[PDB]
Write a protein that binds this ligand. Structure first.
Ligand SMILES: O=C1CC(=O)N([C@@H]2O[C@H](COP(=O)(O)O)[C@@H](O)[C@H]2O)C(=O)N1
Ligand SMILES: O=C1CC(=O)N([C@@H]2O[C@H](COP(=O)(O)O)[C@@H](O)[C@H]2O)C(=O)N1
Lengths: 231, 231
């Protein structure tokens, strides 16, 4: 296990470019996140390579499909033995329930099943195009509520919803929060940001950090520094 | 190439079972869809093996993430050289815009880019939980309008919307529709369904068929039957 609440988003377009970073850090420094980019590129074998080195892996594929597919996919992720696996809460109750139920057969080995609420890159203007009347926070709370009701272990959201969410769902409902920008860092397409420190104070369980770390020369050192701040 | 609008959904938990089927057919008979289940299990290499056989592959991972991730994932799909790649329209305009732009550097090689509107497994009730008051039809049409405004090649929807969409977005805008159930077959978690013949008559450009084919007592003849019906 590890003590840092940091999950580094491995978003490279090259395998060796990722492992060059990974070989310089240690499983106690952080957990790793394999998303759509690196998974579309290298598949489940890359995830096994990381599990080989001993890291906990968060397969971030945000499964957002029909119940049938969602279940089989989560079951496939469970076969991979990942630490945590994704799903989109906007996929609905039936889809989320089918996903949870697909993990029962794996018993204890099952990975944590988290639901994405509202992407941290979306503000009201973004949600407004879908005809979504509610603010990011409000809609996100509606999605998390459905997530909790379907028995999921937690949610992915912005740290800007951490205090509120922690209160409405409790300390047990895990909150995984991306949109982490230490001060000075470039926001990019990220919108509901917060600094590593602000996120921890908001009481999040896990913070997802990508570019601030991977975009630096010597990213291991940056990951180290961030961890230092969380003390 | 094939002149059939049929795209068979390869949803198997066993690589060889899937190949045993694929080998009983021919690229001239249909196209194949590799979804989250098989892709999570066997990754990009499976797609290549299907491609090495001459089939046009529809990569269906419904990328629904922050603009930066959607772009890199879509780019990764183009690197795979697939015929068609997926995306979730509810991901917003900025995300879909990033996806379209990430395909520009691939020129002519760029795969077809389509956005999923409302999943065929959903009805009003399913959307109500999300706080969505618009009907599956209207919400879908809204998602299809945004998809076109962002410059995508088409949308994934129900055949129940084909007629409407076709006359509101034009013949050019491509419609890919799952939820295809020939009379007698099981509906399952599918809700907004139509038979192959009805879907064709409805104007869909491509129709996705999974269980009706893969789980039939003789999938090859079932494909043959359907293809013949569509004539
Ligand atoms: O709401 C979310 C969820 C999410 O997974 N992510 C992911 O977090 C990662 C890192 O983003 P960044 O480089 O820190 O901006 C990427 O893999 C994103 O897709 C996000 O940015 N917002
Ligand atoms: O709206 C949609 C999109 C979609 O991709 N699909 C996919 O179409 C496939 C076949 O479903 P079925 O077996 O025909 O019910 C599965 O891979 C689904 O994920 C769907 O059923 N509805």
């Amino acid at each position: 296990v590890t003590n840092s609440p940091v999950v580094v988003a491995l978003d490279y377009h090259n395998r060796d470019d990722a492992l060059a970073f990974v070989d310089k850090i240690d499983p106690r420094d952080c957990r790793l996140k394999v998303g759509k980019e690196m998974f579309t590129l290298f598949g489940p074998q890359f995830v096994r390579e990381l599990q080989q080195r001993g890291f906990d892996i968060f397969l971030d594929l945000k499964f957002h499909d029909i119940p049938n597919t969602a279940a089989h996919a989560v079951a496939a992720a469970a076969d991979l033995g990942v630490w945590m696996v994704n799903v989109h809460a906007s996929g609905g109750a039936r889809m989320m329930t089918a996903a949870r139920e697909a993990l029962v057969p794996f018993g204890k080995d099952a990975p944590l099943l988290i639901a994405v609420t509202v992407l941290t890159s979306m503000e009201a203007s973004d949600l407004v195009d879908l005809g979504m009347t509610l603010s990011p926070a409000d809609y996100a709370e509606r999605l998390a509520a459905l997530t909790q009701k379907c028995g999921l272990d937690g949610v992915v959201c912005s740290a800007q919803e951490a205090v509120r969410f922690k209160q409405v769902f409790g300390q047990e409902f895990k909150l995984v929060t991306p949109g982490i920008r230490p001060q000075g860092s470039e926001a990019g397409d990220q919108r509901r940001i917060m600094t590593p420190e602000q996120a921890l104070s908001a009481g999040v369980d896990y913070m997802v950090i990508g570019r601030p770390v991977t975009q630096s020369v010597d990213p291991a050192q940056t990951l180290k520094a961030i961890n230092a701040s969380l003390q």
